[PDB]
Design a protein around this ligand. Structure first.
Ligand SMILES: Fc1ccccc1[C@H]1CCN(c2ncnc3[nH]ccc23)C1
Length: 167
């Protein structure tokens, strides 16, 4: 039993809700919140900009030190950093950005990072400003993640479309 409330169950391990991931994280304080990161951990917009804003820029400060030490992530890769006031940990995961020409096949590799964590609150990878089809992202999520994932979808119209079209 966990504290996630109001989710629709899609499969044995995948759950979905129309929710602002920032507000959901503040309420649940999950062990892991996933950020829709880029390789430079520059949290300017989309989910990343919103999560970082909610940390009063502490996420960005921590991220800049991470990059100065380690260099950029790989597309499809991840790193674990602090969750600040939102979660115990933040798993920064880099899905391919279609608006940069990145290979959509890397979306499966990106979701594989979730399997290192028993339970996660997450957005749909590569959706939103990353330019991928969110229906496809949900399909890859369900077919790749084996741990327990609670997906927050900000847009109500998109949420209804994802549910109604789910096979
Ligand atoms: F822009 C993006 C970049 C990368 C991945 C996804 C997006 C879109 C699609 C879903 N998404 C969100 N989902 C849940 N909570 C949210 N809070 C603020 C934004 C947001 C924004």
């Amino acid at each position: 039993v966990n504290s996630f409330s109001g989710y629709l169950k899609l499969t044995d391990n995948v759950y979905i809700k129309n929710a602002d991931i920032v507000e959901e994280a503040k309420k649940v304080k999950p062990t892991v919140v996933v950020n829709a990161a880029n390789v430079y951990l520059k949290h300017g917009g989309g989910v990343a900009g919103a999560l970082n804003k909610a940390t009063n820029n502490a996420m960005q400060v921590e991220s800049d030190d991470y990059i100065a030490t380690n260099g950029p992530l790989k597309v499809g890769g991840s790193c674990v950093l602090s969750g600040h006031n939102l979660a115990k940990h933040c798993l920064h995961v880099v899905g391919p950005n279609v608006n940069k020409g990145e290979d959509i096949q890397l979306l499966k590799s990106a979701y594989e990072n979730f399997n290192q964590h028993e339970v996660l609150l997450a957005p749909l990878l590569s959706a939103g400003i990353f330019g991928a089809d969110p229906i496809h992202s949900l399909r890859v999520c369900v077919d790749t993640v084996r741990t327990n994932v609670y997906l927050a979808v900000f847009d109500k119209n998109l949420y209804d479309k994802l549910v109604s079209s789910f096979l």
